Enzyme design. Structure first.
Site, PDB file in Angstrom:
ATOM      1  N   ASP A  61      39.775  48.280  35.160  1.00 17.30           N
ATOM      2  CA  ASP A  61      40.670  48.270  36.357  1.00 17.30           C
ATOM      3  C   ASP A  61      40.555  46.920  37.046  1.00 17.30           C
ATOM      4  O   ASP A  61      39.507  46.636  37.505  1.00 17.30           O
ATOM      5  CB  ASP A  61      40.341  49.411  37.347  1.00 17.30           C
ATOM      6  CG  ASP A  61      41.405  49.641  38.422  1.00 17.30           C
ATOM      7  OD1 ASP A  61      42.285  48.789  38.554  1.00 17.30           O
ATOM      8  OD2 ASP A  61      41.309  50.693  39.134  1.00 17.30           O
TER       9      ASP A  61
ATOM     10  N   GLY B  82      43.381  34.149  37.434  1.00 17.87           N
ATOM     11  CA  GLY B  82      43.306  34.922  38.686  1.00 17.87           C
ATOM     12  C   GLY B  82      43.597  36.426  38.514  1.00 17.87           C
ATOM     13  O   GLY B  82      43.255  37.174  39.400  1.00 17.87           O
TER      14      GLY B  82
HETATM   15  C1  LIG Z   1      39.239  38.186  28.628  1.00 18.78           C
HETATM   16  C2  LIG Z   1      40.230  39.312  28.581  1.00 18.78           C
HETATM   17  C3  LIG Z   1      41.413  39.182  27.836  1.00 18.78           C
HETATM   18  C4  LIG Z   1      42.366  40.179  27.827  1.00 18.78           C
HETATM   19  C5  LIG Z   1      42.174  41.330  28.568  1.00 18.78           C
HETATM   20  C6  LIG Z   1      41.023  41.492  29.317  1.00 18.78           C
HETATM   21  C7  LIG Z   1      40.055  40.481  29.304  1.00 18.78           C
HETATM   22  N1  LIG Z   1      38.829  40.683  30.022  1.00 18.78           N
HETATM   23  C8  LIG Z   1      38.635  40.672  31.355  1.00 18.78           C
HETATM   24  C9  LIG Z   1      37.336  41.097  31.583  1.00 18.78           C
HETATM   25  C10 LIG Z   1      36.747  41.280  32.924  1.00 18.78           C
HETATM   26  O1  LIG Z   1      37.350  40.915  33.930  1.00 18.78           O
HETATM   27  N2  LIG Z   1      35.512  41.784  32.973  1.00 18.78           N
HETATM   28  C11 LIG Z   1      34.760  41.824  34.214  1.00 18.78           C
HETATM   29  C12 LIG Z   1      34.871  43.092  34.999  1.00 18.78           C
HETATM   30  N3  LIG Z   1      34.151  43.331  36.065  1.00 18.78           N
HETATM   31  C13 LIG Z   1      34.535  44.549  36.621  1.00 18.78           C
HETATM   32  C14 LIG Z   1      35.505  45.228  35.955  1.00 18.78           C
HETATM   33  C15 LIG Z   1      36.164  46.530  36.262  1.00 18.78           C
HETATM   34  O2  LIG Z   1      36.919  47.058  35.463  1.00 18.78           O
HETATM   35  N4  LIG Z   1      35.948  47.025  37.492  1.00 18.78           N
HETATM   36  C16 LIG Z   1      36.415  48.364  37.889  1.00 18.78           C
HETATM   37  C17 LIG Z   1      35.310  49.384  37.563  1.00 18.78           C
HETATM   38  C18 LIG Z   1      35.650  50.851  37.707  1.00 18.78           C
HETATM   39  C19 LIG Z   1      36.721  51.443  36.747  1.00 18.78           C
HETATM   40  C20 LIG Z   1      36.846  52.947  36.961  1.00 18.78           C
HETATM   41  C21 LIG Z   1      37.889  53.587  36.056  1.00 18.78           C
HETATM   42  C22 LIG Z   1      37.614  53.305  34.614  1.00 18.78           C
HETATM   43  C23 LIG Z   1      37.534  51.809  34.369  1.00 18.78           C
HETATM   44  C24 LIG Z   1      36.458  51.165  35.262  1.00 18.78           C
HETATM   45  C25 LIG Z   1      36.822  48.344  39.372  1.00 18.78           C
HETATM   46  N5  LIG Z   1      38.003  47.786  39.671  1.00 18.78           N
HETATM   47  O3  LIG Z   1      36.030  48.737  40.239  1.00 18.78           O
HETATM   48  S1  LIG Z   1      36.026  44.347  34.559  1.00 18.78           S
HETATM   49  C26 LIG Z   1      36.813  41.304  30.287  1.00 18.78           C
HETATM   50  N6  LIG Z   1      37.694  41.033  29.338  1.00 18.78           N
END
Ligand SMILES: Cc1ccccc1-n1cc(C(=O)NCc2ncc(C(=O)N[C@@H](CCC3CCCCC3)C(N)=O)s2)cn1
Length: 340
Positions: A165, A30
């Site tokens: 994020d 989650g």
């Molecule tokens: C398996 C694992 C193990 C240890 C640590 C991390 C992970 N892990 C989780 C993901 C994941 O959730 N990926 C799917 C995602 N969709 C959207 C994502 C996201 O970061 N949105 C941001 C995007 C915008 C930000 C703007 C600032 C810079 C970073 C992106 C948001 N909250 O709107 S991440 C990939 N790998």
């Protein structure tokens, strides 16, 4: 060229995804949202698939959906999470009600690299270098993260790092800049540089720099290290009530960081001094920090790229729910995948 989809029950909801994505299994318990790990049959690599929650329920949900897709479509940098794919089972705007995002699957977050033990100075150089390289890129597009912390930073086995994020793009206050918690209101991009200083201290020592019990305690721990505001900073505060309040949590001088980080590389201590400045106008920038002598073995001024400009003007607009939904549908249709 529309793919064939398949349905299954995951996270007690029906997921409907292209046959391209095999062996879906929930990850994160989650902490990432509704996310599954999957095997990408086009590349032979593992990916993360996020299903958005109730994306067009309300104007606020619809604008949040649009914002996250626009941010992910912009990010094209080694040290920032990117968009590998975005899809909907809907065949038209009329039936559009679900959005799925596909990213790289990371291995571990920075809490799971540190595990309450010190890292080597060379490992700290390499991790903080990559965070700053990512931040130079994000800041050059006038994007500020505002919630950097160990849980939002992740690596693969080769220790290659990306910024993500897991909250709502704009939990713990241990990494938050003092101006935000004092409601000073005129924030700049170096709120993210404060967070990096706190993270770098923790990688070196194995312990949280400012583990406050509550909001008051968080500010008292910060002011014991960085001191009561100097004359130059007090001259930039409007309210008498605000000037009294900051002075009432301090009445104490800045400590010398060389007396706090015993045994550390003296270049590490100099950089922490330039990151953890109370006056955010005097705090080092990401681009300045990349040129600091601490990163001599990694710094390449010809491979620290900047972003294309990001049009944020939608953030000022008041649109109807069907308009946010149509803008989002157009951004799904226009997506071009990155090269194989
Ligand atoms: C398996 C694992 C193990 C240890 C640590 C991390 C992970 N892990 C989780 C993901 C994941 O959730 N990926 C799917 C995602 N969709 C959207 C994502 C996201 O970061 N949105 C941001 C995007 C915008 C930000 C703007 C600032 C810079 C970073 C992106 C948001 N909250 O709107 S991440 C990939 N790998």
């Amino acid at each position: 060229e529309r793919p064939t989809f398949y349905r299954q029950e995951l996270n007690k909801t029906i997921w409907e995804v292209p046959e391209r994505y095999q062996n879906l299994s929930p990850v994160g318990s989650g902490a990432y949202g509704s996310v599954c790990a999957a095997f990408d049959t086009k590349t032979g690599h593992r990916v993360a698939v996020k299903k958005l929650s109730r994306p067009f329920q309300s104007i606020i949900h619809a604008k949040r959906t649009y914002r996250e897709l626009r941010l992910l479509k912009h990010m094209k940098h080694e040290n920032v999470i990117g968009l590998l794919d975005v899809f909907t089972p809907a065949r038209s705007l009329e039936e559009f009600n679900d959005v799925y995002l596909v990213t790289h699957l990371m291995g571990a977050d920075l809490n799971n690299i540190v595990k309450c033990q010190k890292l080597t100075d060379d490992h700290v150089q390499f991790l903080i270098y990559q965070i700053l390289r990512g931040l130079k890129y994000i800041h050059s597009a006038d994007i500020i993260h505002r919630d950097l912390k160990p849980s939002n930073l992740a690596v693969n086995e080769d220790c290659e790092l990306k910024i993500l994020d897991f909250g709502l793009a704009r939990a713990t206050r241990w990494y938050r800049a003092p101006e935000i918690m004092l409601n000073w209101m005129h924030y700049n991009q170096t709120v993210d540089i404060w967070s990096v200083g706190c993270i770098m201290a923790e990688l070196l020592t194995g312990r949280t720099l400012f583990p406050g019990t509550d909001h008051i305690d968080q500010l008292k721990l910060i002011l014991r290290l960085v001191g009561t505001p100097g004359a130059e900073l007090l001259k930039k505060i409007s309210s008498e009530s605000a000037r009294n309040y900051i002075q009432s949590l301090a009445q104490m001088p800045k400590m010398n960081f060389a007396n706090v980080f015993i045994g550390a590389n003296p270049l590490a201590v100099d950089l922490l001094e330039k990151m953890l400045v109370l006056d955010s106008d005097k705090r080092i920038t990401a681009a300045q920090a990349l040129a600091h002598a601490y990163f001599a073995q990694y710094h390449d001024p010809d491979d620290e790229p900047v972003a294309d400009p990001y049009d944020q003007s939608f953030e000022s607009r008041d649109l109807l729910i069907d308009e946010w939904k149509s803008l989002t549908y157009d951004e799904v249709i226009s997506f071009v995948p990155p090269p194989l």
